Amino acid sequence: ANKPMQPITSTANKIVWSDPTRLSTTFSASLLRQRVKVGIAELNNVSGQYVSVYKRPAPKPEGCADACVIMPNENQSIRTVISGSAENLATLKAEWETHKRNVDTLFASGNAGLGFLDPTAAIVSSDTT
Amino acid sequence: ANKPMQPITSTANKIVWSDPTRLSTTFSASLLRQRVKVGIAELNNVSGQYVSVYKRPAPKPEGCADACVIMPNENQSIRTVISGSAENLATLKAEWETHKRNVDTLFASGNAGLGFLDPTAAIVSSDTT
Amino acid sequence: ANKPMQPITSTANKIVWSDPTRLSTTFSASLLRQRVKVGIAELNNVSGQYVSVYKRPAPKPEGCADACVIMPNENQSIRTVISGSAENLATLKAEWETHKRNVDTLFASGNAGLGFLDPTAAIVSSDTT
Amino acid sequence: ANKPMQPITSTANKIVWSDPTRLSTTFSASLLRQRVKVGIAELNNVSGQYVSVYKRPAPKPEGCADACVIMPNENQSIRTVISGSAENLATLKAEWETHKRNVDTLFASGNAGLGFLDPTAAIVSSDTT
Amino acid sequence: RRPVSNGNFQQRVKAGDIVVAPYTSDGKITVKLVAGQKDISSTPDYDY
């Protein structure tokens, strides 16, 4: 399994989790409810900032296991935001998951993480055919 | 496995897409590549900013207006950015998965979309026991 | 068989207790978290400021009774600040317990509270041999 | 078998101890006495600052002891002050005794050292039933 | 209570827009049930 993280700053909108065994690893979720007027209609807007930070150490050069060799740790920030209406939450879920498949086919399976972006990499829409 | 969009603007940095049937939905992808001096060593950091945008109309007023009285569209947008050393990509891919789990375990499988934060929501880190 | 109290004002940093029967006495505990560089390495620093207040008017000059409650109130404050790296809690706790009997030598067994100093007192460190 | 300390610096108010083997560790005690007048009463106010500080090396990285790798040092400081009148000192010890177990439950027994505040901690008051 | 916040309510009202939101203040509903004796039977009588 993976180490569960406990809340640090418990608030009605912000909850910040951190690994007890490694306080560097954090994952905070910030949320903001609002009543929004767009046109001839009232909609509620829910914004969720989902950011996870890991202070990963520098990669170990070549293939030495060694032992007591410390290298400076670099941050790894992965932040997402969600915007939409609660009455459209069910259809937002589909967009969220198809966003996942679009990203991973471009980043996880793809090599955009290395900086190489692929124009021909096929990506998929939300609504079904 | 639904309808695939096709690109609209290809560039060394930003590549955007759009569904031919509905140009409203887009999937932008921009990269910023930098050199970071962590310590007595130089590393390349890339900021992959991914945006998914779709215009979704407000729900019908209990089916009393209906026929071609089209109300404006909301802003169902999901922005996600990923930053980190390209040398630690593989482990950065791993935390990308647990980022999905942490988001899904409270938002997709939870009511975070509604807006109620869950202090007891089970959230784990990338590391394994 | 003491009288337990319940928290009266809670916050992400400050939590205040107070006895329902006697609201004067409080055990207010604050906590501050920071991260620092020492050996170009990250150590998470935690500062715990614990305060206990009590107001118990009883000088009681010799042995009168009846109308001898006119004597004013006096304040008793006992405050403790604990600071250190979170990574060293296991060995920091040994410092706490050593700090306990150390002050008890001066305060509990000794008469330092009256205002006296005893350089001949037995003060011992946490490190053993 | 803990190593004991003996005084270094003597002063009218402040006395400090230090370990001959390791001079980094110290335990100081500074006292302050004031003349306090209230209605038909004389109070002997004493404030005793009790500072115990260690210079503990930073945690060596796990999985290796090897040839000495000198980690830096950080200061683990534990400081307390006792404020009150001299006449009611004897019954003040119990409050100080309560302050021991009160903190021990929250910090030593609990995980408040990491920064985990527990509003459900079972803490009691000086007065009993 | 079911409070709702109207986004940038102050900015909208400064711009001149009018904002209306549903609300439900905290309530208090109680019922008293008072026991009452019942004369199930009474027949004998006497004079004073």
What percentage of amino acids of chain A are in beta strands?
35-45%
Radius of gyration of chain E: 30 Å
The CA-CA distance between the termini of chain E, in Å, is: 63 Å
Oligomeric state of this protein = part of a larger assembly
The rounded Rg of chain A comes to 20 Å
What is the distance, rounded to the nearest whole angstrom, between the alpha carbons of the first and last residues of chain A?
38 Å
Strand content of chain E: under 5%
Q: Which structural class do you get from the secondary structure elements of chain E?
A: little secondary structure
Helix content of chain E: 10-25%
Principal-axis shape of chain E equals: rod-shaped
Number of strand elements of chain E: 0
Biggest interface, residues from each chain: A-B, 79 and 78 residues
Subcellular location (chain E): Virion
Family (chain E): Belongs to the Leviviricetes maturation protein family.
Organism (chain E): Acinetobacter phage AP205
Protein name (chain E): Maturation protein
